[PDB]
Design an enzyme around this catalytic site. Structure first.
Site, PDB file in Angstrom:
ATOM      1  N   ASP A 138      50.445 -53.274  17.561  1.00 47.13           N
ATOM      2  CA  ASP A 138      49.693 -54.426  17.795  1.00 47.13           C
ATOM      3  C   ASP A 138      48.655 -54.799  17.264  1.00 47.13           C
ATOM      4  OD1 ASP A 138      49.001 -55.873  20.051  1.00 47.13           O
ATOM      5  OD2 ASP A 138      47.149 -54.561  20.819  1.00 47.13           O
ATOM      6  N   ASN A 143      42.744 -56.852  16.637  1.00 47.84           N
ATOM      7  CA  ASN A 143      42.131 -55.676  16.920  1.00 47.84           C
ATOM      8  C   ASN A 143      41.465 -54.899  15.398  1.00 47.84           C
ATOM      9  OD1 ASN A 143      43.174 -55.267  19.839  1.00 47.84           O
ATOM     10  ND2 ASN A 143      45.584 -55.233  18.832  1.00 47.84           N
ATOM     11  N   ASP A 156      41.263 -50.745  17.399  1.00 48.21           N
ATOM     12  CA  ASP A 156      42.184 -51.008  18.522  1.00 48.21           C
ATOM     13  C   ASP A 156      43.774 -50.037  18.611  1.00 48.21           C
ATOM     14  OD1 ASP A 156      41.682 -52.497  21.905  1.00 48.21           O
ATOM     15  OD2 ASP A 156      43.973 -51.502  21.185  1.00 48.21           O
TER      16      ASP A 156
END
Ligand SMILES: Cc1cccc(Cl)c1NC(=O)c1cnc(Nc2cccc(C(=O)NCC(C)(C)CN)c2)s1
Length: 273
Positions: A138, A143, A156
């Site tokens: 991701d 993030n 993250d």
């Protein structure tokens, strides 16, 4: 596995809310450490009452993953409160928040060298993660977190079509090489000050373009070498993509000979005559 510190609730103060979700909130606060001798600013994420077993496993799993890492460009875990409720994960506090939002609020304000330095840091964090046999899946500017000194940290670890490599979309084949594709999209996000990849295209339209060989065009004011590097991250054949070690090395060489960044890729125009 590296040890996650269980923090006593008396050592944590919550001062300001910086985000909220269905599952809980993120606060800025302070942590007392070194047995009362030291106080540091922290971010605090909570899991509020009623959470499911799956939510607990994911919540503490992210903390357990983060606690395995000790790298300049990976967010530092201070510890967790799990013996008391609501449970908390406590990290270092990053003053400038998420990288995509930060750049969108600072449009045009950084130098090319500064942006390339941000990418070098993100690349070093990703090289570390990949070397530790972790696949992020991701990776995106949303993030990444930015501190007051403009250092970028992969942040993250909880796990989005337009960041994802084609073989991961179509076959669920997530690897460091599909993270490299994502890093290429992050390079484009940084050099555009947080533009949305592929702009108005739908997810199906992005898949159509990429599998036809289309790739994102150059950002404005983008060094040729940087655009060439993100294009190599987007090789359809994953074996042809750079490794994170190659990316870090290339970015280092460009920063150390900064006149190399003055050769810009042509920004293809809207006709104004
Ligand atoms: C605590 C925690 C658990 C798991 C995973 C992570 Cl990555 C974290 N840590 C964090 O989420 C955060 C660490 N640092 C953060 N800083 C942050 C996040 C969002 C906004 C801001 C911020 O202050 N932004 C400036 C604005 C413009 C919003 C005005 N306050 C600051 S959020």
């Amino acid at each position: 596995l590296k040890f996650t510190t269980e923090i006593h609730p008396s050592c944590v103060t919550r001062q300001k809310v910086i985000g909220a979700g269905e599952f809980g909130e993120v606060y800025k606060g302070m942590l007392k450490t070194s047995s009362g001798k030291k106080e540091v600013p922290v971010a605090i994420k909570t899991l509020k009452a009623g959470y499911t077993e799956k939510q607990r496993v994911d919540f503490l799993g992210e903390a357990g993953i983060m606690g395995q890492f000790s790298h300049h460009n990976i967010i530092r875990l201070e510890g967790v409160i799990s013996k008391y409720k609501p449970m908390m994960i406590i990290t270092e506090y990053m003053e400038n928040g998420a990288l995509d939002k930060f750049l969108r609020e600072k449009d045009g304000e950084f130098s090319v060298l500064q942006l390339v330095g941000m990418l070098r840091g993100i690349a070093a964090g990703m090289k570390y993660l990949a070397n530790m046999n972790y696949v992020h899946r991701d990776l995106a500017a949303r993030n990444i977190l930015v501190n007051s000194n403009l250092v970028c940290k992969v942040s993250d670890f909880g796990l989005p079509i337009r960041w994802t490599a084609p073989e991961a979309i179509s076959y669920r084949k997530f690897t460091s090489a599909s993270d490299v594709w994502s890093f290429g999209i992050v390079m484009w996000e940084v050099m555009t000050y947080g533009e949305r990849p592929y702009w108005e295209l739908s997810n199906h339209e992005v898949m159509k373009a990429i599998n036809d060989g289309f790739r994102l065009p150059t950002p404005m004011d983008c060094p040729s070498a940087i655009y060439q590097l993100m294009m190599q991250c987007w090789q359809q054949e994953r074996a042809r993509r750079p490794k994170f070690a190659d990316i870090v090395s290339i970015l280092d060489k460009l920063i150390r000979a900064p006149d190399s960044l003055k050769t810009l890729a042509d920004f293809d125009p809207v006709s104004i005559r």
